[PDB]
């Protein structure tokens, strides 16, 4: 397939016979990649569970949300500490988490009872679920929960972990409400105290090791890798490669991985932006994550090719058209010339043809007119003459 | 020459709506960044909001953000300021402008090279 | 969140001479991500330097600044009678957001 202009068509079509007439067909085929790995400027030394540990374990009606900033974080000893009891990831692998950047990660720490993590998902039932710690439905992060029965336990539990079960309306996605009110659950009014028909809609925890296993302590962590439109802060164990442009490779930029030729670009952003996307919204051009320079991605293998050819009956000499590609030594670069032998001679060299439908080379071009008996396209025609 | 044209001013009255429009010429529109920029009469200048070449980055100021919004078109090389709900506070002179950034190694330099001509806007 | 402040809010001075425009930040403006534009009254802005050092394309070496940290000032030598107008201070890195300072009118003493 790899050796002919005509020993594409014949693979294109599935026949070892082509007949006389335009081909457009597939890939060029070979194209030898490699990697290129770039991931910015790092600070070291993250705030891992080792911090998230101990004692001082955060309230449930009372947590915070742990700014963690610039660190690399590798996130397979979270995986493989082999301690916690419930991973379910959000649209992220939690096994190959390690090959991704963000731009901050929010950890929210507090406890809940043994049957809550069924409920602290995206989009649950029940009370403790919406009006205690709310979760959005797209969201993309990770649970982490374990057991803590001889850690977040004394003799009769403790009373400073209160779940709220309570309240007029339902919360919106990772909100905190740390009041201390009374609620009304009836006829008579509260107003501060307790009575008749007044609920306390904070409750308390019991945590013994008589009680049960879907009431025991199980502090929750849940990690949101968000991507905001800001440099990746927070990243994972990607050693680094250099920067070789144009030849193409697969690739990696802040956790976007690609496949593309790299070349330099004309094109101004913002102060902080990555990613610059399509109409499609595809990707078109990447900020360096490093040097902060300007870079262009634009798709190799191909350039629009339509093998003319008079059959194999008669004999095996072609010649190409590509569409777009106006032949000034230009289908060096857009046939990216590392192919082998046999095709380089219908690349440059001589009977170049410029044309409306771009360029054909591996043909003649004669001052008179014909007949059409192959058509072409804007307005060209060729033959087989002997 | 670089050329951007920009229209949509005049007199409206509170709370209603308008879209103003600048056209570009003479570069790739595509291939730079677009901001809006106002100016009150007798102050100094207010910054408004900045879009990206693609239109997936958009951020607005402070006092700016929710009401206005940006989008572009690069078919047409124009770029759209849709606002909604005026006040009579954003009384101003409006402005395109494209940012050009030059490299250096040590970081990467940001100004305002071309603008537009102006254009009032009266909230009464 | 950088507000900007200038002083003065408009010079006075007669034509020849050095006039000397100072900006001045909330924070620590990190490797000088402003520039410094000319709206002439009436007229849309014109940039006169960027990076707080450089100077643009047709602008002469008559304007020149320099700062660092949180003082930022303008040196304009040889006052020529195109030169008074409205003199900016304008940030643009650091923050995603533009800020802009409160400028000063070169007058006519």
């Known amino acids: 397939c790899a050796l002919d202009p005509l020993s594409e068509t014949k693979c294109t079509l599935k026949s070892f016979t082509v007949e006389k007439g335009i081909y457009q067909t597939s890939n060029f085929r070979v194209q030898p990649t490699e990697s290129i790995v770039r991931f910015p400027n790092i600070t070291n030394l993250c705030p891992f569970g080792e911090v998230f540990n101990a004692t001082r374990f955060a309230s449930v009606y009372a947590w915070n949300r742990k700014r963690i900033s610039n660190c690399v974080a590798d996130y397979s000893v979270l995986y493989n500490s082999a301690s916690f009891s419930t991973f379910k990831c959000y649209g992220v692998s939690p096994t190959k988490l390690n090959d991704l950047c963000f731009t901050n990660v929010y950890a929210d720490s507090f406890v809940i009872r043994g049957d809550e993590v069924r409920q602290i998902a995206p989009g649950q039932t029940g009370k403790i679920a919406d009006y205690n710690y709310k979760l959005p439905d797209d969201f993309t992060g990770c649970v982490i929960a374990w057991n803590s029965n001889n850690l977040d336990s004394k003799v009769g539990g403790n009373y400073n972990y209160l779940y709220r079960l309570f309240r007029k309306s339902n919360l919106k996605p990772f909100e905190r409400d740390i009041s201390t009110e009374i609620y009304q659950a009836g006829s008579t009014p509260c107003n501060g105290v307790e009575g008749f028909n007044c609920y306390f809609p904070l409750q308390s925890y019991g945590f013994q090791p008589t009680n049960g296993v879907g009431y025991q302590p199980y502090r929750v962590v849940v990690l949101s890798f968000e991507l905001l439109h800001a440099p990746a802060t927070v990243c994972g164990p990607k050693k680094s490669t250099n920067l070789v442009k144009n030849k193409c490779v697969n690739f990696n930029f802040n956790g976007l991985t690609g496949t593309g030729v790299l070349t330099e670009s004309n094109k101004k952003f913002l102060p902080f932006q990555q990613f610059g996307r399509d109409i499609a919204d595809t990707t078109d051009a990447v900020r360096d994550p490093q040097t902060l320079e300007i870079l262009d991605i634009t798709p190799c293998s191909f350039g629009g090719v339509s093998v003319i050819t008079p059959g194999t009956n008669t004999s095996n000499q072609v010649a190409v058209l590509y569409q777009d590609v106006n032949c000034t030594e230009v289908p060096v670069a857009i046939h990216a010339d590392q192919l082998t032998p046999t095709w380089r001679v219908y690349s440059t060299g001589s009977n170049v043809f410029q044309t409306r439908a771009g360029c054909l080379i591996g043909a003649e071009h004669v001052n008179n007119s014909y007949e059409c008996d192959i058509p072409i396209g804007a307005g060209i025609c060729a033959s087989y003459q002997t | 020459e670089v050329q951007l044209v920009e229209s949509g001013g005049g007199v409206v009255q509170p709370g209603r709506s308008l879209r103003l429009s600048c056209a570009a010429s003479?570069?790739?529109?595509?291939?730079?960044?677009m901001h809006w920029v106002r100016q009150a009469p007798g102050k100094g200048l207010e910054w408004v909001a900045v879009?990206?070449?693609?239109?997936?980055?958009?951020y607005y100021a402070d006092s700016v953000k929710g009401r206005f919004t940006i989008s572009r078109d690069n078919s047409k090389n124009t770029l759209y300021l849709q606002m909604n709900s005026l006040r009579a506070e954003d009384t101003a002179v409006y402005y395109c402008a494209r940012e050009n950034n030059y490299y250096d190694s040590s970081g990467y330099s940001y100004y305002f090279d071309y603008w537009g001509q102006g254009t009032l806007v009266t909230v009464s | 969140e950088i507000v900007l402040t200038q002083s003065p809010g408009t010079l006075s001075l007669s034509p020849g001479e050095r006039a000397t425009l100072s900006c001045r930040a909330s924070?620590?403006?990190?490797?000088?991500?402003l520039a410094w534009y000319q709206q002439k009254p009436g007229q849309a802005p014109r940039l006169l330097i960027y990076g707080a050092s450089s100077r643009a394309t047709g602008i002469p070496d008559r304007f020149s600044g320099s700062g660092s940290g949180t003082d930022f000032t303008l040196t304009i030598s040889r006052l020529e009678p195109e030169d008074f107008a409205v003199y900016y201070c304008?940030?643009?890195?650091?923050?995603?957001?533009?800020?802009f300072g409160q400028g000063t009118k070169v007058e006519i003493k």
């Open positions: 304008q940030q643009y890195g650091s923050s995603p957001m533009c800020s």
């Open positions: 003479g570069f790739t529109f595509s291939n730079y960044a």
């Open positions: 879009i990206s070449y693609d239109g997936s980055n958009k």
């Open positions: 924070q620590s403006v990190s490797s000088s991500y």
